[PDB]
Paper text:
In Gram-positive bacteria, nitrogen homeostasis is controlled by an operon encoding [name] (GS), a dodecameric machine that assimilates ammonium into glutamine, and the [name] repressor. [name] detects nitrogen excess indirectly by binding glutamine-feedback-inhibited-GS (FBI-GS), which activates its transcription-repression function. GS generates glutamine from glutamate, ATP, and ammonium by a mechanism that involves the initial phosphorylation of the γ-carboxyl group of glutamate by ATP and the subsequent incorporation of ammonium. The structures show FBI-GS binds the [name] C-terminal domain within its active-site cavity, juxtaposing two [name] monomers to form a DNA-binding-competent [name] dimer.
To visualize the active, transition state (TS) conformations of the GS proteins we reacted them with l-methionine-S-sulfoximine (MSO) in the presence of ATP and solved the structures. In these structures, the Met-Sox-P methyl group occupies the ammonium substrate binding site, thus mimicking the GS transition state and preventing further reaction. Structures of the Pp, Lm, and Sa GS-Met-Sox-P-ADP complexes were obtained to 1.98, 3.50, and 2.95 Å resolution, respectively. Hence, the contacts in the Pp structure will be described here due to its higher resolution. In the complexes, the ADP adenine N6 is read by the carbonyl oxygen of Leu326. The side chains of Tyr199 and Arg329 make stacking interactions with the adenine base and Ser247 makes a hydrogen bond to the adenine N1 atom. Contacts to the Met-Sox-P phosphate are provided by Mg2+ ions and the side chains of GS residues Arg314, Arg329, Arg333, Arg334, and His243. The Arg296 side chain interacts with the Met-Sox carboxyl moiety and the Met-Sox-P amide nitrogen interacts with the Glu132 side chain as well as the carbonyl of Gly239. Catalytic E flap residue Glu302 contacts Asp52´ and is close to the Met-Sox-P methyl group. The Glu302–Asp52´ interaction would shield the Met-Sox-P from attack by bulk solvent as well as facilitate proton abstraction of the ammonium to form ammonia.
Residue numbers in the entry:
A (entry chain B), C (entry chain B): 2 to 81, 85 to 442
B (entry chain A): 2 to 81, 84 to 442
Amino acid sequence: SYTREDIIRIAEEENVRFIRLQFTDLLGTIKNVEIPVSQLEKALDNKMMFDGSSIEGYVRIEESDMYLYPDLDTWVVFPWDRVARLICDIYKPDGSPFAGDPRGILKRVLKEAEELGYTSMNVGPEPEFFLFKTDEKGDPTTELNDQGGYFDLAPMDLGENCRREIVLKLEEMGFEIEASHHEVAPGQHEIDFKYADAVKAADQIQTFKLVVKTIARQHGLHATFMPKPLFGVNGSGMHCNQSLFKDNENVFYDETDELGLSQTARHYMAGILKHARAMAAITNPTVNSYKRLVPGYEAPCYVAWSASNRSPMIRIPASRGLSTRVEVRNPDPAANPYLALAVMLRAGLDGIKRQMALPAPIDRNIYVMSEEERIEEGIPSLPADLKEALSELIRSEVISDALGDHALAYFYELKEIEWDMYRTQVHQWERDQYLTLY
Amino acid sequence: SYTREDIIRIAEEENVRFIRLQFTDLLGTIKNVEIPVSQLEKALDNKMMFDGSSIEGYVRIEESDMYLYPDLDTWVVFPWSDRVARLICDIYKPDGSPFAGDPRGILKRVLKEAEELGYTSMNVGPEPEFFLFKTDEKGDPTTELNDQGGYFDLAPMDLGENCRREIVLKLEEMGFEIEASHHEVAPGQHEIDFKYADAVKAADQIQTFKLVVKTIARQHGLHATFMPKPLFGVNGSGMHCNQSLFKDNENVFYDETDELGLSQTARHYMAGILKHARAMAAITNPTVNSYKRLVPGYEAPCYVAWSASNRSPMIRIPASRGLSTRVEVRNPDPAANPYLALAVMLRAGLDGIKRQMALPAPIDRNIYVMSEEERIEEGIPSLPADLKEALSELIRSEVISDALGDHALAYFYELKEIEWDMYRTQVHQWERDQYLTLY
Amino acid sequence: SYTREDIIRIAEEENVRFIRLQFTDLLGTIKNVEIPVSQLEKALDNKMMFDGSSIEGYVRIEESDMYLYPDLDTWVVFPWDRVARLICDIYKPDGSPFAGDPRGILKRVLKEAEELGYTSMNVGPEPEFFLFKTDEKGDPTTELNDQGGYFDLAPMDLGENCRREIVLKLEEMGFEIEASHHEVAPGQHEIDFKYADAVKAADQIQTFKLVVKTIARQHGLHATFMPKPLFGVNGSGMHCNQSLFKDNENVFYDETDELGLSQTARHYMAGILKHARAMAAITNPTVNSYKRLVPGYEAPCYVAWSASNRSPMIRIPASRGLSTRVEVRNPDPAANPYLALAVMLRAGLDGIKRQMALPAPIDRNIYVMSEEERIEEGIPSLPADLKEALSELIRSEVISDALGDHALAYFYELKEIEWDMYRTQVHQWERDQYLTLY
Ligand SMILES: Nc1ncnc2c1ncn2[C@@H]1O[C@H](COP(=O)(O)OP(=O)(O)O)[C@@H](O)[C@H]1O
Ligand SMILES: Nc1ncnc2c1ncn2[C@@H]1O[C@H](COP(=O)(O)OP(=O)(O)O)[C@@H](O)[C@H]1O
Ligand SMILES: Nc1ncnc2c1ncn2[C@@H]1O[C@H](COP(=O)(O)OP(=O)(O)O)[C@@H](O)[C@H]1O
Ligand SMILES: C[S@](=O)(CC[C@H](N)C(=O)O)=NP(=O)(O)O
Ligand SMILES: C[S@](=O)(CC[C@H](N)C(=O)O)=NP(=O)(O)O
Ligand SMILES: C[S@](=O)(CC[C@H](N)C(=O)O)=NP(=O)(O)O
Ligand SMILES: [Mg+2]
Ligand SMILES: [Mg+2]
Ligand SMILES: [Mg+2]
Ligand SMILES: [Mg+2]
Ligand SMILES: [Mg+2]
Ligand SMILES: [Mg+2]
Ligand SMILES: [Mg+2]
Ligand SMILES: [Mg+2]
Ligand SMILES: [Mg+2]
């Protein structure tokens, strides 16, 4: 790991002139202040301050002073006067860590895993995105960047150059990129990168979204991670591939098993399934998230698992060994990555600690099953809208405890205001259906 | 009470050349075929047919032949060239039995349950509010309301005076007893009140009222709508259903010894309305948009409660006594099928009487500003928050399900489940505005 | 006076098909419901009801039922199926008169005058108005109907036909019209009518405004009684000419006096002056009212009186006998006529009852006096804005008592919301002055 002295040294060597101190609000939005390198020693002394009452989910105006403590291992130089980055943890002025810090929330849950002997939670996220064209002014239009489809080539796929420049920038920043391709829906794109320990994976999701939007704009496009920008075509998921490790060993892997899944893996999966409905408000946190969780678009809407199957909530991909993993498919890229990893880890650990029995897999296209069949086989549904998910979240002591009292209370208040504003709108669909009929 | 010979005579007297045979589909939409007067004897002979598979909620393509039996007492000439009259018809199957899914037959069935308990009439006074929108050169509505006036305003703040006045003149030529007309609370919103009538006639008059309003509004270059909530942030349109039971000429809801003038029968009736309020919401508030009106702060109900002279609760008792003593059920909106709405409210009320239900305490506050904590304290239930929740309550209610009958219930549920599922998968512009640049 | 039986009879004789039951909200806005003549007997039985929670200043949603009791002497037929009118008083369902009814408030103050022996308060109001052109859609533009001036003729004055049709309609409705002319500002107009007892004068102001706006629209124009629609030109006043009578005798008249003013007249004037600042919130009730009360436009802004002088708050016109009167010039036509007459009568009566000493007149152009001179002669200012006027209103027990507790509390709450909304706006003037300067 880097020391204080290492950062000073490297900042001079690479001639860094500016440093961004970055952190994440409750809703997952990245935030930063930029300081000249003359201030780097002040920043490393943990003395930078900000207004916590202007950051969503943090504190109130009457006790608004908060501090940034940089995590020196997050040091990296931006490719696009040299600018560098430090991701920071949030502290109160009395020196204690801030309970509502999403990154601290993940670290707290990860300590629970370490005490059970798991040295790391490895996470490979797949944050899909759409690219929209922009007008003369630079705002997004309703027109997608192309009308291509899954694995298409140019000129059907017009995202090749934009995705490739994203990849080159991510690689200069230390990402191990695995693949790049057009996704199923028009104007939809995917760039995959190697799994990493959970905190780093969530840091990389934040950085990934930032690089994607920055490069998209240089190409005259607008990138969005909105879960379902368009009816009738695929939405964008952020599948969270997960495994637990003991130093070097993927403990989810058992070569004697049919699917390569250890008993620990199956208990973990059972925990994800058990608490699926209760974590949905965190993994699928917008009104629009539930427009993606509709049947027929390779997004889940029922609580089930199956191997090599893209209809259920959990897929077990058809590979084994170090790549043995649980693919939880319901999160979308609007989820706060720190909170989403935290609640899924706590749900998985509860499954392990209580040795929860794994339900039988649903080895079929779950979308074409009737409600009758779903009831016969005891297949629950994911929540149908944000309000229902929120009601399940507050009733869950396991998921509530993951979040802690502060984030839970702020998250619920924000989302109840969001839902009440949505629910009272009169949408154009209603005018089209009813204005001339009634 | 008109005979066939009366209708023949009157059509000649008035020089009627065409007759509309009118009826109502399951969702409340009026339907008709127009016949020349040369065909009137065939129509009075109950021989007119139609395709029941093309009328929402009736029958399937493989069993699609259906008959119209005119109700002779619904005869009226339209006042607005070659004279046109109408008859409202009941729906019959080719074997001669009345169609189980006919909304007008459904209300008549429930009314017979009232008659056997001694009540000779259910008197109903509906207040169907509506908006007037301007139209473009092609005649379709724009987003602009006809005016920006408000409650009881005068011209030129209220620009609907002439349109409302001509509606009133046409309705009175058609035998309506008009009581009042005024601008309502929201911009471009209007109200025309007419005297209560027995339930079937009241529902027939609701169907006729909506037709005349839309026809005259179009003559004035406007588009009338009974959509419950066309615009966020201003009042929606309700159809308050004022209700009383009579024994020949006596209003059995009236008791002068009572502080509000309500008899014990009225109080039991109200208790049945409140008991079944959530279960009949899908009928009285049958669209997705209905539930954007059932939000607090706009004189539409949100919570299941009653109060005197209070416009915040579900039931208001107006500060009138005597023949005008009544129960104002405020939650229906003018998208409700009037025959089905009256049928389920009547059934709920009668169930409250047969079971001698205890009437909850009144909520004598602005219920909108009560905290959720206070509302649980008093045990005030909520109306369903959306159409899907309303449908779930409907199919679980034996009392409301049996008001509708097996046929209408099954078709209503199938239609509305499809409607809900279509709405719930849409991505609305609000979502793009909130999320496309934030995420 | 008319009886119930008289109204039924006349309604049949003149073939009236519809009746408007009219009344006035707290802010002076006329309101009505239209009933078919079949309902006339119900209306005369005092059984018509309305939602008092939708009428500004009346009652709350939880006790919203209110009743209309028509005043049979207000019967009149509209000129423009015959429609008639009845002005109504407001009652609660328990049968008591509604304390917040502006017309009942005036009648209550008038009872105070009758007990002192004055049989009527005669009031001649001069409600000036502007006419604006309208667009293709019918909304007002910024363009006035003409660019004429005081007493101008066509084609400089383009309001002649519109004013003349207003006059003809008012005369068919029983008005005694006295004069019609273009006023000082472009597009500004005046129609005068004979004084009447106070309640009738206020009824006639309501009817006058309605006829003016109706006929203006038939001519493709928009009439407004806004006090000051345009900077730098005259605003619109509603001068309230006032006198007290004993049966037939103008008690303000004394032929032995220099100005023809009785001692009663001078005490009344002293009361108006004493409470000028305290009644301003009622006589000048909008934010815009105080844009008219600026110097140089024949509107008052200082508390003073003078004969044949159009600079002060009170003018004594140069005529005597039955036309001896006190012209209170500060009210504008946005004032509720019932409340405005009520507070000025109560102020005048307080002057009589306390035999208040009349200050010396200010026989000069008061606009060109320096602040120093104004202080030397003890000339107070009218309030500078609505907020200051409201603060003076609540501190006045004489004017507060005129209004009664209900109207006072609703009026203050409405106007404090109005003022707080105005005071936080950022106006274009501020952008023009400061956006490029700072
Ligand atoms: N043991 C593991 N634990 C967690 N993630 C893993 C593991 N092995 C591989 N992954 C990651 O899972 C993700 C798979 O993404 P992708 O190749 O898009 O899969 P698919 O499209 O089949 O879902 C990659 O980020 C990959 O690095
Ligand atoms: N006994 C009664 N039963 C049913 N309806 C009645 C009865 N008495 C009056 N009504 C009706 O109730 C309705 C009241 O409507 P409206 O006058 O708009 O009342 P509000 O606006 O006060 O709710 C009218 O249709 C009236 O005829
Ligand atoms: N004794 C009186 N009391 C009240 N008003 C009066 C009396 N005599 C005349 N008036 C009225 O005063 C008003 C004078 O208006 P106007 O002729 O426009 O006067 P000016 O333009 O000079 O102010 C008229 O309504 C007139 O009828
Ligand atoms: C072909 S897809 O299966 C698309 C998934 C969809 N966009 C969703 O999760 O909403 N995803 P993957 O990258 O896992 O193969
Ligand atoms: C003033 S209002 O109270 C408006 C009610 C509202 N439009 C609704 O029921 O949605 N109705 P009413 O005619 O009963 O007085
Ligand atoms: C010439 S004017 O003096 C105009 C008065 C001005 N409009 C005002 O009172 O604001 N009025 P009047 O009709 O009294 O002669
Ligand atoms: Mg993938
Ligand atoms: Mg994918
Ligand atoms: Mg995947
Ligand atoms: Mg009404
Ligand atoms: Mg109404
Ligand atoms: Mg009503
Ligand atoms: Mg004048
Ligand atoms: Mg003048
Ligand atoms: Mg004057």
